[PDB]
Design a binder for these strands. Structure first.
Ligand SMILES: [Mg+2]
Ligand SMILES: [Mg+2]
Ligand SMILES: [Mg+2]
Ligand SMILES: [Mg+2]
Length: 328
RNA sequence: GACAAUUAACUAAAACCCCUACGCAUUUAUAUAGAGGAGACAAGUCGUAACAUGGUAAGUGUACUGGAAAGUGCACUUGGACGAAC
């Protein structure tokens, strides 16, 4: 899928007149273009020019041009990063991202990420799955390969996983729970409300909405009990964390609605009251390999109208600088 | 008397920055080597200028002169007189 955008509609092939000129407007504090940076990102050919586009993508965010870092500016930093090693830096720019700022929720996430299975990347792609969750996303079909990835190392670690990592799995299983094609789209989200549910009782309800966007209401375990009832319209772990509360700071609630360190019985008895019928009416990681095999027709159609739309965003973003050196 | 008159711009924006006046100059006041005036009065001195026709009627203007009041010329004044029939 490399050979579809790289007809770049040829421009100049130097950087050292240009990664100089991107600083002499920054000694005088003057804003720069969206298109002096694009000519700098389109001249990476080594590991060092990754850095010279990295130290200079530091300074476009911290500039008068806070925006006007295009979508096609972003991906030509990615699409030119996966040439050499594709190991650390494009992972790093979403690790920091606050002085780097890409937020690529398009098929441009997919082009970096689907390369990472070829090097299998368990401890490297451990974090980008956590840190593509730092944006709200998922009208594109990349919801499946995400939850295909998270169940690969979920069974690998059987711990509390961190002070913070367990609630990230819940957000990396709840907000990916838009796969309504099967009972899996409600039984994955069954687990998604589940492992948010324990920690607030252990730690406090403020831990849910600390950095990533989930709602703040004490109803999370209840929402499973309303989507355990959506599989009844048409799995072992949730017993054991629940009984753990049945076994041996800023407050935001009022008083006839009691706290959920006093809501032990109805959280237990209702979990059996349909489990008795869940066995009456009608494994996790193997089937999504078939959901890899059966779904995802690989809609490159939205990519290829975008590259022409990037070409529709291309010329009129330079021919503005065509008049500006013939009207003087 | 100066300078600035630029980039950047699917949201719009960031950047803008000079200076030369003051000197025992300019204006009034205080202080003074020295010179001069006016006023006052515990007692001097030289005259006798004025007040009576003040012993040359007094005075004004002005000039000249003299220890000092003053003197005199020239022209005015009565704020002097001429004694009021012959
Ligand atoms: Mg006499
Ligand atoms: Mg006489
Ligand atoms: Mg004589
Ligand atoms: Mg004579």
């Amino acid at each position: 899928d490399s050979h579809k955008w790289e007809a770049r509609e040829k421009e100049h092939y130097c950087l050292a007149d240009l990664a100089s000129l991107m600083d002499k407007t920054f000694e005088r504090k003057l804003p720069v273009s969206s298109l002096t940076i694009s000519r700098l990102i389109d001249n990476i050919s080594s590991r060092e020019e990754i850095d010279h586009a990295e130290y200079y993508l530091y300074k476009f965010r911290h500039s008068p041009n806070c925006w006007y870092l295009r979508n096609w500016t972003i991906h030509t930093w990615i699409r030119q990063c996966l040439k050499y090693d594709a190991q650390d830096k494009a992972l790093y720019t979403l690790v920091n991202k606050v002085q780097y700022g890409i937020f690529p929720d398009n098929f441009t996430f997919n082009l970096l990420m689907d390369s990472f299975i070829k090097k299998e990347n368990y401890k490297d792609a451990l974090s980008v799955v956590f840190e593509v969750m730092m944006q709200e996303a998922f009208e594109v079909p990349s919801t499946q390969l995400l939850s295909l990835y998270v169940l690969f190392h979920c069974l690998a670690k059987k711990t509390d996983f961190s002070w913070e990592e367990e609630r990230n799995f819940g957000a990396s299983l709840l907000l990916p729970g838009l796969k309504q094609k099967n009972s899996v789209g409600f039984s994955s989200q069954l687990y998604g409300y589940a492992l948010l549910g324990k920690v607030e009782l252990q730690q406090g309800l403020r831990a849910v909405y600390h950095n990533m966007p989930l709602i703040w209401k004490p109803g999370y375990l209840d929402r499973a009990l309303q989507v355990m009832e959506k599989v009844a319209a048409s799995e072992a772990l949730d017993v054991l964390g629940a009984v753990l509360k049945a076994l041996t700071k800023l407050v935001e609630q009022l008083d006839i609605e009691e706290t959920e360190q006093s809501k032990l019985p109805q959280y237990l008895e209702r979990f059996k009251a349909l489990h008795s019928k869940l066995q009456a009416l009608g494994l996790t990681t193997q089937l999504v390999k078939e959901k890899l095999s059966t779904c995802e027709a690989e809609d490159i159609a939205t990519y290829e109208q975008n590259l022409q739309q990037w070409h529709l965003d291309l010329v009129q973003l330079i021919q503005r600088e065509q008049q500006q050196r013939e009207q003087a």
